[model samples]
Target: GPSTSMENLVSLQNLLVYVNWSSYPKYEPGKEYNQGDIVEYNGKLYKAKYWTTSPPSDDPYGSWEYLGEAEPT
Candidate 1:
């Protein structure tokens, strides 16, 4: 017997199963990027600070800033 409502339980299960594990696009040189664009490089995540073709780095004062380390699943 389910302890919670069947609908609620089913929704929870669905949510867990449908979790998004989307991968960011690989970094490419000379590619245009806009602010807030995300990319994965060297097993890390970075967010674009402005429009540019430069690759994202760990620099805080650059076109792209490091968001954080990506978790492997």
Candidate 2:
């Protein structure tokens, strides 16, 4: 049997951290986003803290949580 089980020979996985904003849908003011939902806005990514109709504010009390900068050009 050709071995390929754990493939667990992992190394330095955390050496680089990258999040593709394209993975999440873009933020639209017209849509209602639920908690945990992520959106991309202005080259940054934000996670919805709660169900909200507002855009990603990236504020502490805002509807969304600031996940940090995304793909910035």
For model 1 the TM-score comes to 0.57
- Model 2 misplaced regions, further than 4 Å: 1-22, 58-60
| lDDT accuracy of residue 7 in candidate 2 | 17
What digit string (tens of lDDT, one per residue) describes model 2 on residues 12-37? Answer: 11122254232555676675566776
Evaluated against the true structure, the overall lDDT of model 1 is 0.59
Pick out the ten consecutive residues of candidate 1 with the lowest summed lDDT: 5-14
User: Across residues 1-73, which tens digit of lDDT does each residue of candidate 1 receive?
Assistant: 6564221121232234444433555676665666666667888877777665577655556877777867756
Can you tell me which runs of candidate 1 are displaced by over 4 Å? 1-21, 58-61
